[PDB]
Paper text:
With in vitro transcription assays, the anti-σ factor of σL, RslA, was shown to inhibit σL-dependent transcription of the σB gene in a dose-dependent manner. RslA responds to oxidative stimuli with the release of the Zn2+ cofactor, followed by the formation of a disulfide link between proximal cysteines of the HXXXCXXC motif.
Crystals were readily obtained from an expression construct that had σ4L and RslA. There are 10 molecules of the σ4L/RslA complex in the asymmetric unit. The 1:1 stoichiometry for the σ4L/RslA complex seen in the crystal structure is consistent with biochemical data. About 23 residues in the N-terminus and 22 residues in the C-terminus were disordered in the crystal structure of RslA. The crystal structure shows that the orientation of domains in the σ4L/RslA complex is different from that in Rsp ChrR, the only other structurally characterized ZAS–σ factor complex.
Author numbering:
A (entry chain A): 98 to 177
B (entry chain B): 25 to 86
C (entry chain D): 24 to 85
D (entry chain C): 101 to 177
Write the structure that this text describes.
């Protein structure tokens, strides 16, 4: 990766710190659907099978999971 | 309307290809959903700052 | 004639620095044009995520 | 034996790859570096030897070009 200025380097590390913190603060169920969809690339159907719930429930669960994440991210200063 | 619940899935890339087109169609004529996705469009960018391994460690470690 | 109009892609792709991201979210709170812009672009990451960086590097080399 | 959804997913992946192959080299370069390599605007500037502002507008045009193709290809509406 190219070299960044010192401030950029630190700020980005701070950000990764807070984002990680925000995800740790998710309930297990909210983190579970975010991990599967975004980090593992799974589809709602696949998440439905692995988790043991209806697909419609995977959708709504993700809706709440991301909105909760956002709340923490705002409180944390990461996003407005 | 069940669509309102699809915003996060859509923005996270988790909608099957058929659901994705259904939702994109709904979005063209639904200002509420449209504003919902707009609220979330910054989230994948933030999520992308961590790798799946870092994330898995956060889970195992709860 | 307002420079923020060019930042929409970098924002949605996750390429803005922490500082740049704050300025832009600030501007977004008051510019309906830039908001419509990021809204148009926000299915893009989800589409891009369907390929890995290796496939993409292979394509770019040729 | 192929599920209707895995077929559609396979098609979309071909088309998105295809759409990325149709971008100009300069557009593919900035998209590759921001999204896939996770580089910042400033890092992309350094690596390409162009101004940061140019990286932003270039990314602006590149993403819009990608989208035009993906629309014509039928991937997105
Ligand atoms: Zn709606
Ligand atoms: Zn603006």
């Amino acid at each position: 990766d190219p070299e960044q200025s010192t401030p950029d380097e630190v700020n980005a590390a701070l950000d990764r710190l807070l984002i990680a913190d925000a995800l740790a603060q998710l309930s297990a169920e909210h983190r579970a659907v975010i991990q599967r969809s975004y980090y593992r690339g799974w589809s709602t159907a696949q998440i439905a099978t692995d988790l043991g719930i209806a697909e419609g429930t995977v959708k709504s669960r993700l809706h709440y999971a991301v909105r909760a994440l956002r709340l923490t991210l705002q409180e944390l200063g990461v996003t407005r | 309307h069940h669509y309102a619940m699809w915003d996060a899935a859509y923005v996270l890339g988790a909608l099957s290809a058929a659901d994705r087109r259904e939702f994109e169609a709904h979005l063209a004529g639904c200002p509420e959903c449209r504003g919902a996705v707009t609220e979330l469009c910054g989230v994948p960018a933030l999520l992308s700052q961590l790798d799946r391994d870092e994330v898995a460690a956060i889970s195992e470690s709860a």
